[PDB]
Amino acid sequence: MHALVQLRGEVNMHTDIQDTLEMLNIHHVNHCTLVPETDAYRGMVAKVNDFVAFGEPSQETLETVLATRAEPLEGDADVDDEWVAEHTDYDDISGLAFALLSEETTLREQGLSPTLRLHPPRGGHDGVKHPVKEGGQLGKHDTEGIDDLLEAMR
């Protein structure tokens, strides 16, 4: 399971690439979604590779982001362990995080919006003109690299 965050805006990006992001439920910069590692999904992230940051987050990090940015399919009801327990097939955020990372369920299945609307990266990110290996923030990240980014955008 990979966490996907759009880091580059829609202006001037190929339409078929913008549509791909929308099919992955991301319609804004800094919006994040969790995608199963399938051959079908793999082609999609590969196509959006130059306008996004992605990788597999750690259990803890996922839990931090879910607690802080997860939302109900509809409504403003805050999502905490109690919400999780009283609305999902899990006991608390941790149980959800584990099931997601192991690809057993999806935010939608559990009555949660497929998107995590993150905050701008505190302290800024590594730039959107170069990939990770070159010192930028675009492309596939380390579990640690992805964790660093997601946390800065908690």
**CB of 61 closer than 8 Å to CB of 147:** yes
Residue 89 C-beta: closest distance to Mg ion, Å: 21
Q: Which does 124 bind (CB under 5 to 8 A by kind): Mg ion, RNA, none?
A: RNA
> Which position among 118, 146, 149, 150 is part of the footprint of RNA (CB under 7 A)?
118
**CB of 143 closer than 8 Å to CB of 57:** yes
Q: Which does 87 bind (CB under 5 to 8 A by kind): RNA, Mg ion, none?
A: none
- Give the whole-angstrom CA distance, residue 77 versus residue 23: 25
Regarding 57 and contact with RNA (CB under 7 A), the answer is: no
Q: Residue 83 belongs to what H/E stretch?
A: helix 81-87
> Which position among 1, 17, 81, 95 is part of the footprint of RNA (CB under 7 A)?
17
Regarding 37 and contact with RNA (CB under 7 A), the answer is: no
Smaller CB separation from RNA, 41 or 98: 41
- Kindly state the tokens that stand for 56: 């597999």
Residues 6+ apart with CB under 8 A from 77: 83
Q: Which stretch binds RNA (CB under 7 A): 30-38, 81-89, 94-102, 143-151?
A: 30-38
Smaller CB separation from Mg ion, 14 or 122: 122
**CB of 119 closer than 8 Å to CB of 53:** no
Query: Which residues here bind Mg ion, judged by CB under 5 A?
Result: 127
- Give the whole-angstrom CA distance, residue 52 versus residue 55: 10
> Which position among 2, 31, 53, 99 is part of the footprint of RNA (CB under 7 A)?
31
